[PDB]
Ligand binder design. Structure first.
Ligand code: HEM
Ligand SMILES: O=C(O)c1ccc(-c2ccsc2)cc1
Ligand SMILES: [Cl-]
Length: 393
């Protein structure tokens, strides 16, 4: 009934070009079994959406990586939000929602936009740049650690720590075990910055700690919630912005549309998130026997969702493999869906928007002018190096 496939979605060959294998996964059936890792897989939009939106049956408290916390010890203490289910999830979620609220975006937008404009001006002086190190990495590094309230010293630990976190959702392959063995100094730095005294006034970190007064979280919960933002808040946006620039570089017609109407910047970024899907995959664990897509899955089984695949499923999208900055993007699952849907999505969109706005207003052309190199991660899709020439408007 359920087809079995030998495809390894965490292999380097798969990362290098996942799209043919993703079609194979979609077309095999609504539910497949991945013999390589003994997990169920869903790669169509319909089933990915269904799983995300039934948190009771498809839980997160047994981990959203391959590892089942009921069987193995988590590599770090569980996240109070990502790796929790309702009701435990609900109050910590509400706190991060308020910390990263619509109202909060007003306090940081001017600074984020200024830094984006400044970066693009700086890059135009050089002309030929690496759109990863010099833009996709440099810009979020120039605004997010400050918005968190982090000191300057030690920030070089942030991207390695995030790479570790997202590799750790994967199976115990080489990527994962190498990350974990190098992890000690990054964990030590991050855990220390989570303490209240080390987070500057007015920043996201201080604001989380300030909520420990209200009855929503206790003081001992605040450091792990800061840890969530230091885990999920930087490397994701690096790959999202990298994705957007890569799309504009490959699809010059869309850059030209963006230049002609810079107010398309926000949707151009959203479409980039759909099109590349910086977060490719993660898991749920079944809490009961369940019927999904006409198949029966037993209790305590890992289910691997292919978010990137769902975002290219022709059953849901017209011309899924085209980058279209005026596409109706609502419903894409690049930020997830349901109760765990990215709590930081307003920050992500703000960064993406103001950077694409800067490019739209200041840059006439983006031409790849060197070898493109991919960055491999069990969960994240993105580039290591993207040599481009920027032509000023
Ligand atoms: C382009 C950038 C981003 C992408 C693609 C992205 C993607 C996602 C996805 C797919 C989830 C769902 C996980 C699940 O359902 O198990 C998620 C959750 C989460 N994200 Fe984002 N994210 C991004 C940026 C951010 C930022 C900027 C922050 C914080 C400042 C952040 C913090 C979080 C947190 C704390 C969760 C857990 C929410 C929950 O479990 O309720 N992320 N993200
Ligand atoms: O709470 C945290 O530490 C945390 C929250 C979310 C992610 C994530 C995973 C797949 S997409 C976004 C990672 C870590
Ligand atoms: Cl840690």
């Amino acid at each position: 009934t359920i087809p079995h496939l030998a495809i390894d979605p965490f292999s380097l060959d798969f990362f290098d070009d996942p799209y043919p294998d993703q079609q194979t996964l979609r077309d095999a059936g609504p539910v497949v079994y991945l013999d390589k890792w003994n997990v169920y897989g869903v790669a169509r939009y319909a089933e990915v959406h269904a799983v995300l939106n039934d948190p009771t049956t498809f839980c997160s408290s047994r981990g959203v990586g391959l590892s089942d916390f009921k069987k193995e010890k988590p590599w770090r203490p569980p996240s109070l939000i990502l790796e929790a289910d309702p009701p435990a999830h609900t109050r910590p979620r509400a706190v991060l929602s308020k910390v990263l609220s619509p109202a909060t975006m007003k306090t940081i937008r001017d600074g984020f936009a200024a830094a984006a404009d400044a970066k693009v001006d700086e890059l135009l002086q050089r002309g030929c740049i690496d759109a990863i190190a010099d833009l996709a990495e440099a810009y979020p590094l120039s605004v997010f650690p400050d918005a968190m309230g982090l000191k300057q010293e030690g920030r070089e630990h942030l991207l390695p720590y995030a790479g570790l976190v997202f590799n750790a959702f994967g199976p115990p392959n080489e990527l994962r075990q190498t990350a974990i063995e190098r992890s000690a100094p990054h964990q030590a730095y991050v855990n220390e910055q989570c303490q209240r005294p080390n987070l500057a006034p007015g920043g996201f970190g201080a604001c989380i700690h300030a909520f420990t007064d209200t009855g929503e979280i206790t003081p001992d919960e605040a450091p792990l919630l800061v840890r969530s933002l230091l885990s999920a808040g930087l490397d994701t946006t690096v790959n999202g912005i990298g994705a957007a620039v890569y799309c504009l570089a490959r699809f010059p017609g869309e850059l030209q549309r963006l230049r002609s109407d810079p107010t398309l910047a926000r949707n151009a970024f959203e479409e980039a998130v759909r099109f590349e899907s910086p977060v490719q995959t993660f898991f749920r664990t079944t809490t009961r026997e369940v019927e999904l897509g006409g198949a029966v899955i037993g209790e305590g089984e890992k289910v691997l969702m292919f978010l990137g695949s769902a975002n290219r499923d022709p059953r849901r999208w017209s011309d899924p493999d085209l980058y279209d900055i005026t596409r109706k993007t609502s419903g894409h699952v690049g930020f997830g869906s349901g109760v765990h849907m990215c709590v930081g999505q307003l920050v992500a969109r703000l960064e993406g928007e103001v950077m694409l706005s800067a490019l739209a207003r200041k840059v006439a052309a983006i031409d790849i002018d060197g070898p493109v190199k991919r960055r491999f991660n069990n969960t994240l899709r993105g580039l290591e190096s993207l040599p481009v020439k920027l032509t000023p408007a």
